[PDB]
Amino acid sequence: VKYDATVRNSINQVVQLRYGEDGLAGESVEFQNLATLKPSNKAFEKKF
Amino acid sequence: IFPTGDSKVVLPCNLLRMIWNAQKIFHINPRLPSDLHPIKVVEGVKELSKKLVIVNGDDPLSRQAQENATLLFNIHLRSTLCSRRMAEEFRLSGEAF
Amino acid sequence: QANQKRITTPYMTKYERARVLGTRALQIAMCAPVMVELEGETDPLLIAMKELKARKIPIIIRRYLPDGSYEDWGVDELIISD
Amino acid sequence: DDEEETYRLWKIRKTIMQLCHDRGYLVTQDELDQTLEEFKAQFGDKPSEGRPRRTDLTVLVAHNDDPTDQMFVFFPEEPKVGIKTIKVYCQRMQEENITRALIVVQQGMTPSAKQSLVDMAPKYILEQFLQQELLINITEHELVPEHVVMTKEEVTELLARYKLRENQLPRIQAGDPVARYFGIKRGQVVKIIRPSETAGRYITYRLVQ
Amino acid sequence: YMHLPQTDNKKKIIITEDGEFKALQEWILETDGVSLMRVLSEKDVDPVRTTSNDIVEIFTVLGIEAVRKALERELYHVISFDGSYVNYRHLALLCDTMTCRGHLMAITRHGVNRQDTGPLMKCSFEETVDVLMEAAAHGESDPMK
Question: What is the C-alpha separation between E102 and D207, in angstroms, rounded?
Answer: 9
The separation between CA E144 and the C-alpha centre of its own chain, rounded to angstroms, equals 31
Question: What is the C-alpha separation between C79 and C32, in angstroms, rounded?
Answer: 24
- Identify which of B55, E63, B14 has the alpha carbon closest to the alpha carbon of residue D194: E63
- Identify which of D178, D176, D174 has the alpha carbon closest to the alpha carbon of residue D187: D174
CB proximity list for B7: less than 8 A, separation 6 or greater: A33, A34, A35, A37, A38
In chain B, what residues touch A39 (CB-CB under 8 Å)? none
β-partners of residue D101 are D126
Q: How many CA atoms lie within 13 A of D140 on its CB side?
A: 12
Contact predicate A18/A1, CB 8 Å = no
CATH class of segment(s) C1-82: alpha beta
Angle at which helix B60-80 crosses helix B38-49, to 10 degrees, equals 140
**Count of pairs with CB atoms under 8 A, one residue in B, one in E:** 11
Reduced to 3 states (helix: H, G, I; strand: E, B; else coil), residue B40 is: helix
- Identify which of B49, B33, B21, B42 has the alpha carbon closest to the alpha carbon of residue B93: B33
Could B4 and E13 be called an inter-chain contact, meaning their C-beta atoms sit closer than 8 Å? yes
CB proximity list for C21: less than 8 A, separation 6 or greater: C45, C48, C49, C52
Question: What is the C-alpha separation between D148 and D154, in angstroms, rounded?
Answer: 12
Contact predicate D80/D114, CB 8 Å = no
Share of chain C residues as helix, strand and coil, in percent rounded to the nearest 5: 30, 15, 50
- Taking the CA atoms of chain E, what radius of gyration do you get in angstroms? 21
Question: What is the C-alpha separation between E99 and D10, in angstroms, rounded?
Answer: 34
- Identify which of D122, D116, D128 has the alpha carbon closest to the alpha carbon of residue D183: D128
E strand or H helix at B66, and its extent? helix B60-80
Question: What is the C-alpha separation between E59 and D45, in angstroms, rounded?
Answer: 37
Show me where the domains of chain C are located: 1-82
Judged on CB neighbours under 10 Å (0-12, 13-18, 19+), D157 is: middle
- Identify which of D22, C54, A8, A46 has the alpha carbon closest to the alpha carbon of residue E20: A46
In chain A, what residues touch D202 (CB-CB under 8 Å)? 17, 21
Contact predicate D89/D97, CB 8 Å = no
Per residue in C4-21, is it b (16+ CB within 10 Å) or e — as a string? eeeeeeeebeeeebeebb
CB proximity list for D61: less than 8 A, separation 6 or greater: D20, D25, D26, D27, D70, D71
Method by which the coordinates were obtained: cryo-EM
Sorted by where each starts, the structural domains of chain D and their CATH numbers stand as 1-136 (3.40.1340.10), 137-209 (3.90.940.20)
Contact predicate C25/C38, CB 8 Å = no
Question: What is the C-alpha separation between E21 and D189, in angstroms, rounded?
Answer: 38
Reduced to 3 states (helix: H, G, I; strand: E, B; else coil), residue D70 is: coil
Q: Helical H runs in chain D?
A: 2-23, 29-32, 36-42, 84-96, 111-118, 152-162, 177-182
What is the DSSP pairing of strand C70-74 with strand C60-64? antiparallel
Question: What is the C-alpha separation between D163 and C69, in angstroms, rounded?
Answer: 10
Contact predicate D8/D135, CB 8 Å = yes
**Count of pairs with CB atoms under 8 A, one residue in C, one in D:** 3
Q: How many residues can be counted in chain D? A: 209
Q: How many CA atoms lie within 13 A of B78 on its CB side?
A: 11
Declared resolution, Å: 3.4
Identity at C45, one-letter amino acid code: L
Reduced to 3 states (helix: H, G, I; strand: E, B; else coil), residue D36 is: helix
What is the DSSP pairing of strand E12-14 with strand E22-24? antiparallel
Identity at E119, one-letter amino acid code: P
Enter the DSSP assignment of B34.
Answer: P
β-partners of residue D203 are D193
Rounded to 10 degrees, the C-alpha dihedral D30/D36/D39/D45 comes to: -170
Maximum distance among all alpha carbons in chain D?
A: 60
Contact predicate D70/D60, CB 8 Å = yes
Contact predicate C36/C56, CB 8 Å = yes
Residue of A nearest to C70 (CA): A3
Question: What is the C-alpha separation between C22 and C59, in angstroms, rounded?
Answer: 12
D176 CB within 8 Å of a chain E CB: yes
- Identify which of B91, B95, B94 has the alpha carbon closest to the alpha carbon of residue B23: B91
B25 CB within 8 Å of a chain D CB: no
Question: What is the C-alpha separation between E139 and E133, in angstroms, rounded?
Answer: 10
Enter the DSSP assignment of C27.
Answer: H
In chain D, what residues touch A12 (CB-CB under 8 Å)? 168
β-partners of residue A7 are A16
β-partners of residue D205 are D191
What is the DSSP pairing of strand A30-33 with strand B8-11? antiparallel
Q: How many CB atoms lie under 10 A from the CB of residue B69?
A: 29
- Identify which of E75, D68, B5, D90 has the alpha carbon closest to the alpha carbon of residue E67: E75
